Point group: D3
Chain length 137, copies 6
């Protein structure tokens, strides 16, 4: 499948999780769009133009993807990821979530997920072809 990796990527622990998710999913044969690899170094970093193109390229890759794969733990920086999960739900993309902390996530996110994971071995054995439901409970 084509997967949009929705996760922050600004500190060491966030990068650990994104890096692993890139590795697990790509090693399964999936095409993963990971926003940290597309910083758009063609316009001025942080300009209005840069903000606009980052948004447009990320949103257009959520629409391009088959599945949105999110990562949310306790690094309370989840506002961009949360937005992209909500957008993905309305766009009709199956939403998957990996939580490293295994904590309690907001109702709107958990109720919208199609598959929820807390260990990478379960992602590695999940049937992306038939896409079985694995709800948060």
């Amino acid at each position: 499948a084509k997967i949009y990796l929705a996760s922050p990527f600004f500190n060491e622990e966030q990068l650990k999780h994104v890096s692993k998710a890139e590795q697990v999913l790509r090693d399964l044969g999936h095409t993963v769009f990971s926003p940290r690899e597309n910083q758009l170094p063609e316009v001025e970093f942080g300009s209005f133009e840069w903000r606009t193109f980052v948004f447009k390229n990320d949103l257009e890759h959520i629409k391009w993807a088959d599945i949105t794969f999110g990562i949310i733990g306790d690094n309370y920086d989840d506002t961009g990821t949360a937005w992209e999960l909500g957008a993905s739900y309305i766009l009709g993309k199956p939403v998957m979530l990996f939580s490293p902390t295994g904590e309690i996530i907001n109702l709107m996110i958990t109720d919208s997920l199609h598959a929820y994971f807390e260990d990478w071995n379960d992602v590695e054995n999940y049937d992306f072809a038939t896409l079985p439901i694995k709800p948060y409970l």
Copy 2:
């Protein structure tokens, strides 16, 4: 206009801002759905029935609304609100955002909003009929 009020309401400070938003928008004549008034009275709290009905009722009222009015502050509790603004954007609802702090906001949210406010008198003078653009700058 019909307005969905997207905001956390889980501690005293968040409740203060929600209360002011309800009062301001309703005194302007708008019909406001405020999720805190719709915690359902009373399916057992936290049951599967309760989680389902709250999610479904909330989402249906985003769909019913003309405009989604969000409150984003210093909260690190903005996960569900951020999700509701992403859903709203895909659903084609104009997003208005109020920030009690005036801090920097994630670019997925700032690039998705139609009008941005940092004072309630600015909301009180906004032309809801014509919906002029009021971007985050």
Copy 3:
């Protein structure tokens, strides 16, 4: 509210229920599109032109409506109505359903409705402005 009245209208009993729905919803001040009043006067009945315009006009009026109000009974004629409720749900129109029989209804319909009624006085007291949830239980 603008209301699309989804119901069969092909025998005397179905016509009775449609007529009562028209009267009740219109006496409440709502603007009701009733497909039986829009059989088009008169492109040749059953022509390709007639089939096209009726389909297009009906679907456009589901899109124009705020709410789709359906009548599901003992009809085994509910095919087009059921189709219109599925379309309505994806289009983000709140679905209200009235069942003259109170029998068991398919779970794709019951899990898609926002308000369920078995008596017209309950419809007469429903708050259309706030659209409270009234689930099938």
Copy 4:
């Protein structure tokens, strides 16, 4: 392609048609989601929770599919299938319909189809890659 099989599956004749459709389409190399194979025996059959998850998993597989393949004859149990065909149309999925009775189907269904079949040999020779229109007439 990925195909959602929309059909009842509760009596012998309905099961005959679903079984054949599973067989024909899968033998062509398509990935078929057939709701009768996913009864969700992880929660209590018939509970509110079961109804909710069946709806969510079926709807999420319509969104996952490329094409919705319906079966409608004269076994007047078509209300769930009709709903899913209407949803599929608004979601933008090409809708295909196989009718064993070859009778007259409601306007909203026939006008929404992309391909209509009355014999399995025609499905077996249809070009799913180019998806030519084969309208009901």
Copy 5:
């Protein structure tokens, strides 16, 4: 109704038709967003900021509108207008079209419109509340 006025406004003749449309639709009591009044006062003309805000404000006002009212004439300048009618159609906005010339129109546009006009008195008598179909013939 809220109406998005889709039309070029780049020479004297196009401006004449836009002006008459504004006057007619506003004298009927409608709330009209007219893109020529929203060239933004004044982000630098033609800047990236200006191109972004105009696009975003225009699209947001198509989403805000109940109806998109288009003017298609002898213009070979109808590119953006044609784009806005295609977007409108997918967004589920009923499309009304006025042609100052009465010439032949592309079938993607004629097969997407809900009401077609060649005289302003016909627009003045149109029932906007019920939105009757008025096809291009």
Copy 6:
């Protein structure tokens, strides 16, 4: 990928560009739907029925496609193509545009594109798998 080729095809220069686009994209392994190859010679050319089925089959192939690939130059016949680009944008399809004249195209089109090309060698080296943004500037 599956690509919808949005372009006029009525004069020699338009046919040159469509023919080349068919050739380049298909030689890359993409499945291209080109409307000129599907004239529907099963009903009467130019009838109402023909106009209806051409629209339905073209729209249904835009929805079937992964990407919409447009061609717009100075052959001012772009009203159907413009419509299909606007529809494709709202449907969530990445929009690509090849311009032979390399001129100035309307704001709504250029701002909506994901990839813009003026030479076929660039299309031949573009990564359709990762779909990088190549904006008009």
